[PDB]
């Protein structure tokens, strides 16, 4: 069914396709993943596979995590994340200790990359919500960037919740859908994905088969 | 009312029957009997049932 892998955003570069068009590609280190646990309906109520990724010194792991990894039967990894499948038929193709690499995907496939958006800090309504500012001249008094009105006058009497105002921005999980895989370099465990994927370089991402275009 | 329904009788019929039987215990001591001496409350329920008419809905 839906495949998936844990990886790292390396950066963006340029390639040219066979028709000489240029393709902006994000390079993802779809490094080797090891299956650490299988979630089954008979035990957990849902079907899922849990993958581990990244390298860490064994002295950096705490005793509970090391115990979980030892019970699974593999050496610890930095990152652990779960892939939600649909049914046990889709869970039967994974077993603990199995190694997942970048070649599970193919050239021209469609993927959904999930990462953590870049942080923006405390942002104003103009940046956080695209509010049009007020005028820069013609008498406007210290309202060049302020939101303006906030509600009604009597019948509202309050501010409706969900009202868009300034606050913290970014640092949220974001999924980009229907990205095309331009090339699957099997030597370096590298995926060439056309477009921009969420997060900063060196961030952790999950690449999954697209849910709409697949 | 709770103790009367525990004896298969409603509060209103029980009060009517107690009034008919002529017993003059007020609701305070009736509740005291209901909580403390259930046997006495059952006996009073019996006498109230005895004092009631045979057809309570009759135009009597």
């Amino acid at each position: 069914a839906r495949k998936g892998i844990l990886g790292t955003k390396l950066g963006m570069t340029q390639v040219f396709d066979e028709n000489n068009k240029v393709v902006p590609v994000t390079v993802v280190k779809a490094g080797p993943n090891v299956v650490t646990r299988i979630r089954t309906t008979e035990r957990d109520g849902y079907s899922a596979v849990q993958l581990a990724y990244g390298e860490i010194s064994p002295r950096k792991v705490i005793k509970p995590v090391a115990g979980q990894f030892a019970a699974a039967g593999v050496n610890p990894r930095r990152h652990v994340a779960e892939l939600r499948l649909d049914d046990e038929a889709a869970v039967a193709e994974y077993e603990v200790g199995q190694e997942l690499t970048a070649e599970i995907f193919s050239d021209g496939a469609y993927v959904d990359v999930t990462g953590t958006s870049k942080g923006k800090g405390f942002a104003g309504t103009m940046k956080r919500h695209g509010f049009r500012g007020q005028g820069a001249a013609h008498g406007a008094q210290a309202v060049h960037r302020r939101p303006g009105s906030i509600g009604g006058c009597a019948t509202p009497g309050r501010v409706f919740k969900g009202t868009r105002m300034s606050g913290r921005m970014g640092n949220d999980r974001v999924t980009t859908q229907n990205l095309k895989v331009h090339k699957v370099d099997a030597e370096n465990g590298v995926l060439l994905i056309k477009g921009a994927i969420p997060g900063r370089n060196g961030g952790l991402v999950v690449v999954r088969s697209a849910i709409k275009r697949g | 009312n709770a103790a009367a329904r525990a004896n298969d009788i409603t509060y209103n019929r029980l009060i009517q029957g107690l009034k008919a039987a002529g017993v003059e215990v007020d609701r305070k001591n009736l509740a005291e009997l209901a909580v403390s001496d259930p046997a006495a409350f059952t006996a009073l329920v019996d006498v109230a049932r005895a004092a009631l008419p045979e057809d309570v809905n009759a135009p009597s």
């Binding site: - | 709770a2 329904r5 409603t10 019929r13």
Partner: protein, 146 residues
């Protein structure tokens, strides 16, 4: 003076009510009476000296008229246009226990003591319950003749 319950005076029992083909309002009223403890001569509105009530077969419950597809359960999220409505039909087919829970909870006082009394109500959509260790007493909704 009038009797007042002390610390260890309250004693609780377990009842189970089979909701199969029982009118929703009737069962809800009976269960509310049992939960409040109104059937005990030692009742006190101050105290929750009620009993534990188990309701099984909640999906088999009886609803008269066309209330199955014409009575709505409402809830507002707090956001504008946050009003959601489900009829008793889909509410029964999705969350069978919720109909009985809502009906019973609407019939007991809305104080903090009512919130405490709510904790002693368990409803189950199946014919069985996990409370066999308490040995519940089967309960029948009877009417005292006057």
């Amino acid at each position: 003076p009038t009797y007042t319950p002390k610390a260890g005076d309250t004693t609780r029992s377990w009842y189970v009510i089979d909701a199969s083909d029982v009118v929703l309002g009737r069962l809800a009223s009976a269960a509310a009476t049992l939960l409040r403890g109104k059937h005990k001569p030692t009742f006190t509105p101050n105290v929750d000296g009620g009993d534990f009530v188990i309701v099984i077969n909640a999906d088999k419950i009886a609803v008269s008229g066309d209330k199955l597809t014409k009575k709505f359960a409402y809830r507002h999220s707090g956001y504008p246009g946050g009003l959601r409505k489900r009829t008793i039909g889909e509410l029964l087919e999705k969350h069978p226990t919720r109909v009985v829970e809502n009906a019973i909870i609407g019939m007991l006082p809305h104080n903090k003591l009512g919130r405490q009394i709510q904790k002693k109500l368990k409803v189950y959509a199946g014919p069985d319950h996990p409370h066999a260790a308490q040995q519940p007493i089967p309960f029948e909704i009877k009417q005292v003749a006057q």
